[PDB]
């Protein structure tokens, strides 16, 4: 499969309630593997997946020191953002960052990522060239000038093409029993009368990993996108995900409808129907 590593940073200010909370979580694909929280009793980067626990004490010291530095850096960034947007010290604000790397089917770099947001809106992004920037507004243009002057993009490129890929490959090998295993969806169709005139057909996909999936209904072979209720893919709590798609069908017409499922864990796409 095609694998990714991501780090997510968030700082949330809370004037009058102490200093801004800073969190970090790391993922490989849909598996969280490390967490840090400045509101922890003793903040430290901590393991969240069995395959990261074998990294020695010096790994944890380095990750913790980075996260403790980042707590201070992102608090400074929240202060800067107030100046950039002419905002007072009374309001609560949020800065977010995502970065990491995607690998292709042969383990080579597919692309890298480095993006920030402020108050939930895109702020600045490193372009796919890993060499230039896209700023969302005139505030981020100030940041862009600073980062061009300091040749920030060159350093992020070196990380994304080097350590990011190398460490992702290490993690994939250490977690090869789980990270490199796709679990296919367990699929079935349920039938729920709504009245004498109509019933809901609900097509279920359960127990799958990773989260990417396609689940659709057809009537007489024609896609029913506008008439399908499609819930967001949701975590089950056991590593796996769930999703369903529902259509309202006239009584007696159930066999005109087919559900279609695509997932990495399936060798071929599936077709299912209501089986009374």
């Amino acid at each position: 499969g095609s694998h990714s590593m991501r780090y997510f940073y968030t700082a949330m200010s809370r004037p009058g309630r102490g200093e801004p909370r800073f969190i970090t979580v790391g993922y490989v694909d849909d598996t969280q593997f490390v967490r840090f929280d400045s509101d922890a009793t003793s903040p430290r980067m901590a393991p969240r997946a069995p395959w990261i626990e074998q990294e020695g004490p010096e790994y944890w010291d380095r990750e913790t020191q980075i996260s403790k530095t980042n707590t201070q850096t992102y608090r400074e960034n929240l202060r800067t953002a107030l100046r950039y947007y002419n905002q007072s010290e009374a309001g609560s604000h949020i800065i977010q960052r995502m970065y990491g790397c995607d690998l292709g089917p042969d383990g080579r770099l597919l692309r890298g990522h480095n993006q920030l947001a402020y108050d939930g809106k895109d702020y600045i992004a490193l372009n796919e060239d890993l060499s230039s920037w896209t700023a969302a507004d005139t505030a981020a243009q100030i940041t862009q000038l600073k980062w061009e002057a300091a040749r920030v993009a060159e350093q992020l490129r070196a990380y994304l093409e080097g350590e990011c890929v190398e460490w992702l490959r290490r993690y994939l090998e250490n977690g090869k029993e789980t990270l490199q295993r796709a679990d296919p969806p367990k699929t079935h169709v349920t039938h729920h009368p709504i009245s004498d005139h109509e019933a809901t057909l609900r097509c279920w996909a359960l127990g799958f990993y990773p989260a990417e999936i396609t689940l659709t209904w057809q009537r007489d072979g024609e896609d029913q996108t506008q008439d399908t209720e499609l819930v967001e893919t949701r975590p089950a709590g056991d590593r796996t995900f769930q999703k369903w798609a529902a259509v309202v069908v006239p009584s007696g017409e159930e066999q005109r409808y087919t559900c279609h499922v695509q997932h990495e864990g399936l060798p071929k796409p599936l077709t299912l129907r209501w089986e009374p």
């Binding site: 800065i95 990380y159 990011c164």
Partner: peptide
Amino acid sequence: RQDILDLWI
């Protein structure tokens, strides 16, 4: 593992 480069906006 994380990048070490400090980003100040």
